[PDB]
Amino acid sequence: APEKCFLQITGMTCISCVSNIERNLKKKDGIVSVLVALMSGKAEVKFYPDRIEPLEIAQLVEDLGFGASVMEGNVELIITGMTCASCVHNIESRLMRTPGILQASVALATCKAQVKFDPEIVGPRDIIRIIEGIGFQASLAHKEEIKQWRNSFLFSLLFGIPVIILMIYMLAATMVLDRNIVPGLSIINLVFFILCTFVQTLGGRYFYVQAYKSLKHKATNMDVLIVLATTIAYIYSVVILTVAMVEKADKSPETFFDTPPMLFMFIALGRWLEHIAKSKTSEALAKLISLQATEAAVVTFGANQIILREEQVAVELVQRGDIVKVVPGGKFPVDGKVIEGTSMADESLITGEPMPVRKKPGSMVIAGSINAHGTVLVEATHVGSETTLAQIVKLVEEAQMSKAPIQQLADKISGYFVPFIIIISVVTLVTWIIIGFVNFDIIIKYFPSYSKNISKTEVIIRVAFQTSITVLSIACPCALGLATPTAVMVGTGVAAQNGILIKGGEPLEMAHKIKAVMFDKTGTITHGVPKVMRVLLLVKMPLKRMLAVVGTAEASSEHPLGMAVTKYCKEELGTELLGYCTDFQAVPGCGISCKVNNIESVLVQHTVLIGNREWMRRNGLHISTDVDEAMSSHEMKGQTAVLVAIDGELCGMIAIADTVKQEAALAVHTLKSMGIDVVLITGDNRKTAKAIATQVGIKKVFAEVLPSHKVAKVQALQSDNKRVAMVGDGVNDSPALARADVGIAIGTGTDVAIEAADIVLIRNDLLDVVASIHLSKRTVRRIRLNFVFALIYNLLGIPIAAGVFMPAGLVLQPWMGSAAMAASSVSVVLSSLQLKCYRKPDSDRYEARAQGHMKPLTPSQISVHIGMDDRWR
Ligand code: ALF
Ligand SMILES: [Mg+2]
Numbered sequence: 123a124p125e126k127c128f129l130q131i132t133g134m135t136c137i138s139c140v141s142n143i144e145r146n147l148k149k150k151d152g153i154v155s156v157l158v159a160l161m162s163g164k165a166e167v168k169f170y171p172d173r174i175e176p177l178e179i180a181q182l183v184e185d186l187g188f189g190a191s192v193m194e195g196n197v198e199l200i201i202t203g204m205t206c207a208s209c210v211h212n213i214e215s216r217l218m219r220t221p222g223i224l225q226a227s228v229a230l231a232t233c234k235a236q237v238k239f240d241p242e243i244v245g246p247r248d249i250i251r252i253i254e255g256i257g258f259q260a261s262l263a264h265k266e267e268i269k270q271w272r273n274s275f276l277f278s279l280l281f282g283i284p285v286i287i288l289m290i291y292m293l294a295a296t297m298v299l300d301r302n303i304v305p306g307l308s309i310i311n312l313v314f315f316i317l318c319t320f321v322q323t324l325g326g327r328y329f330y331v332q333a334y335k336s337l338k339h340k341a342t343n344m345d346v347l348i349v350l351a352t353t354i355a356y357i358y359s360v361v362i363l364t365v366a367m368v369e370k371a372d373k374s375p376e377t378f379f380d381t382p383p384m385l386f387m388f389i390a391l392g393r394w395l396e397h398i399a400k401s402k403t404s405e406a407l408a409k410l411i412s413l414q415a416t417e418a419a420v421v422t423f424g425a426n427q428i429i430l431r432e433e434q435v436a437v438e439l440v441q442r443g444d445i446v447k448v449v450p451g452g453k454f455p456v457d458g459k460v461i462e463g464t465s466m467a468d469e470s471l472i473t474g475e476p477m478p479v480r481k482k483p484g485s486m487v488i489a490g491s492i493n494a495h496g497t498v499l500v501e502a503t504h505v506g507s508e509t510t511l512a513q514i515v516k517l518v519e520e521a522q523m524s525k526a527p528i529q530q531l532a533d534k535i536s537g538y539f540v541p542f543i544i545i546i547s548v549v550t551l552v553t554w555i556i557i558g559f560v561n562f563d564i565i566i567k568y569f570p571s572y573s574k575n576i577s578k579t580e581v582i583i584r585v586a587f588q589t590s591i592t593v594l595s596i597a598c599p600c601a602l603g604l605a606t607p608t609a610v611m612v613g614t615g616v617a618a619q620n621g622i623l624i625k626g627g628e629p630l631e632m633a634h635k636i637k638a639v640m641f642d643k644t645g646t647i648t649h650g651v652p653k654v655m656r657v658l659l660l661v662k663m664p665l666k667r668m669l670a671v672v673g674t675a676e677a678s679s680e681h682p683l684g685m686a687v688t689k690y691c692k693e694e695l696g697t698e699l700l701g702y703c704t705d706f707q708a709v710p711g712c713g714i715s716c717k718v719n720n721i722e723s724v725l726v727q728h729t730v731l732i733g734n735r736e737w738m739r740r741n742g743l744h745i746s747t748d749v750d751e752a753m754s755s756h757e758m759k760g761q762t763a764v765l766v767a768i769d770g771e772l773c774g775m776i777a778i779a780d781t782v783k784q785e786a787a788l789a790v791h792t793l794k795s796m797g798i799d800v801v802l803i804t805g806d807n808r809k810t811a812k813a814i815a816t817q818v819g820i821k822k823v824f825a826e827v828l829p830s831h832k833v834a835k836v837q838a839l840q841s842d843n844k845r846v847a848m849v850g851d852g853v854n855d856s857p858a859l860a861r862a863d864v865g866i867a868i869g870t871g872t873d874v875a876i877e878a879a880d881i882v883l884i885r886n887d888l889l890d891v892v893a894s895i896h897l898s899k900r901t902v903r904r905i906r907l908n909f910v911f912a913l914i915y916n917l918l919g920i921p922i923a924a925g926v927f928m929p930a931g932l933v934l935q936p937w938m939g940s941a942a943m944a945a946s947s948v949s950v951v952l953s954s955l956q957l958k959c960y961r962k963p964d965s966d967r968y969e970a971r972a973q974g975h976m977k978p979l980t981p982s983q984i985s986v987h988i989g990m991d992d993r994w995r
Contacts, residue, residue, distance in 0.1 A: 245441035275390035278325035282383030306367035318379035352382035392603020418455035463498030521861035551590035558582025605908035608954035621885035633898035643804030654690035675716035713737035760810035911949035
């Protein structure tokens with residue numbers, strides 16, 4: 123009992139592996155008990171130290187074929203009625219008195235209690251029972267960004283449309299508007315000042331805080347650009363108005379109060395649209411939590427002659443060492459060993475396939491599995507976080523948190539732009555000061571400011587500052603923000619129209635970078651439902667008659683292969699109605715015997731035996747060499763096969779297997795032609811995976827891959843610097859989908875897989891994945907083009923604003939500033955909208971492009987990898 127040791131085990135891929143390890147270790151003398159988990163690869167062994175040593179245990183585990191290495195409970199409760207300190211003190215004293223409890227404290231302010239103890243000796247149930255006996259009850263314990271950007275945009279609009287309208291009205295012709303309340307100001311100037319001040323105070327607040335955050339990050343983005351430009355323009359306008367007032371100037375100076383409202387308007391709109399597009403809801407965690415069983419039926423004493431009472435207890439409160447009865451159709455509450463129970467379990471959560479798995483005494487079960495075929499009793503071994511489903515939840519959380527935001531190309535452009543605009547503005551200022559100082563005739567000729575009585579130096583300085591600030595205002599791109607959001611929304615709409623649901627804007631901008639794609643085998647590449655592939659005849663009755671007789675015999679069978687056979691027979695036959703007279707008898711996993719005396723019904727449209735080789739061997743029916751070879755070939759192909767005999771005579775054989783999707787081969791070929799790697803990762807048997815890869819022409823095959831191993835492969839491929847797209851439709855694929863750079867979920871897949879994936883194929887056609895790439899390409903290029911439209915119109919303005927074309931007679935006009943934004947925004951919006959004309963490439967185009975290049979692959983060329991370390995053949 124004492125000196126229990128901890129071990130780390132690697133190379134283990136099956137629950138049967140865990141059962142074998144536990145059985146072998148317990149068989150050896152000295153070892154008292156052994157515990158191990160599947161995905162965690164952690165084990166705990168209790169043994170007598172004086173008989174065996176941890177090194178011997180590690181050597182024994184290694185001999186089993188799994189690498190072994192030697193390496194080195196808190197409960198929170200709320201208790202009602204904790205209104206007195208005496209009760210808390212008494213509870214604490216009673217807790218310390220009981221053995222196995224290390225510490226226990228209770229807070230009177232919030233009635234919360236924390237207890238630290240050894241799980242092997244004490245559990246939450248004991249503490250709860252003690253508290254109840256004492257006399258008290260105890261029980262165990264982005265939109266903001268959108269809202270703020272929307273508020274900024276709305277304020278900027280409300281207080282910027284009026285000023286823009288006033289500017290347009292002035293541009294069209296207005297005498298009263300130029301009238302001066304005081305010698306310096308004018309009505310228009312005062313209204314502009316008030317409106318710009320209101321917009322800056324209200325609309326720009328979030329701009330200012332975001333810019334401050336960006337500077338704290340040692341980076342300059344669009345927010346910093348807008349804040350700098352608008353603040354400079356507003357400060358200069360206020361300063362010139364103030365000096366005009368002080369000097370009682372006859373004419374009010376030109377002001378740039380127009381610019382800040384305009385830029386705030388459009389940039390806030392762009393940011394708001396970007397945040398709307400980026401928003402997504404991930405509920406995979408909620409679905410996984412829903413998978414786990416809510417409660418368990420704890421059984422006191424044992425399953426042996428003494429069975430005193432049963433209780434219903436929350437799975438959270440369940441502790442190791444308690445026998446729990448799971449009824450048919452009920453979820454397995456905790457991982458454990460089956461005792462005195464035999465049934466079937468669905469392990470699609472881990473292994474991923476729908477084939478039921480037998481459970482017998484000495485076997486192991488996984489939490490969250492669906493039981494059937496009868497009741498079972500389970501002795502718990504892992505509970506709570508230690509459960510496999512909890513480990514999958516942890517992996518999904520880690521994958522989701524690992525993902526980092528992708529920097530917007532707008533921010534990257536602004537990072538260069540801000541120094542560029544600063545440099546050009548300073549250059550314009552200094553060169554104009556120099557020109558004014560050296561000659562001063564150019565200033566007289568090209569500006570009326572010389573008419574002012576101020577000194578020449580003041581004239582040149584004011585002209586240089588005005589020109590520099592005009593250049594600064596013109597340089598700012600108003601449509602920069604909208605370029606990416608508009609294209610992202612249009613691409614998402616196009617994808618939705620074409621049958622692809624894209625959550626967020628990241629997949630559209632990332633799919634083009636994909637160079638490696640991993641495909642799940644079941645569902646994703648092949649239809650999940652098993653289907654009959656080939657029927658052979660082993661005195662010479664028609665095949666259809668035998669098929670009808672089997673379907674009548676197999677009508678009541680609940681085996682998935684049974685329903686597959688029955689549906690195949692019904693499809694082959696008229697299947698107007700099944701025979702009324704039929705007697706059925708089934709032995710679990712052995713064979714089925716039926717009596718059918720309604721062959722007349724089949725003819726209008728006397729015994730049946732369905733079994734495997736073992737059934738024939740025990741019944742005494744010999745197996746011919748040719749049929750044996752055929753069955754061996756079918757087993758090599760990985761497809762299941764069963765035999766039908768009538769009146770004790772072998773009659774026929776039926777084979778059932780999954781059917782590869784029609785477009786799987788074409789999709790794989792297209793991906794390979796485009797230069798993208800294709801990998802088949804699955805949890806099924808190696809033979810079936812190899813056969814499916816041969817059919818779909820995938821060179822790299824991974825078999826018996828646990829959910830954690832899929833994430834490990836994703837991480838390795840990403841560490842190779844490649845971008846990975848994971849296509850899955852099961853729970854085991856959800857952590858890989860979350861971790862993968864791109865996650866594609868088949869429309870018919872599980873809810874968790876759909877939630878985790880960023881792209882969902884509503885049409886459940888594999889070729890859409892290729893389209894999901896092509897469309898993404900058509901998007902990204904467009905975005906780049908939009909950015910050109912966002913800058914070119916403003917950029918061409920900069921030479922004019924700086925006076926480059928002034929001697930030619932071209933000078934900046936007030937209408938040019940507004941025209942630049944109008945043209946840029948219109949061009950960006952129209953370019954983004956043009957993506958709606960995108961047409962999905964036809965499947966016929968794919969087939970023609972691969973009409974001759976496509977070729978079947980030999981089975982030998984394909985290499986199958988079993989597990990992460992590939993220890994097994
Ligand atoms: F359907 Al799988 F791994 F084979 F998710
Ligand atoms: Mg699947």
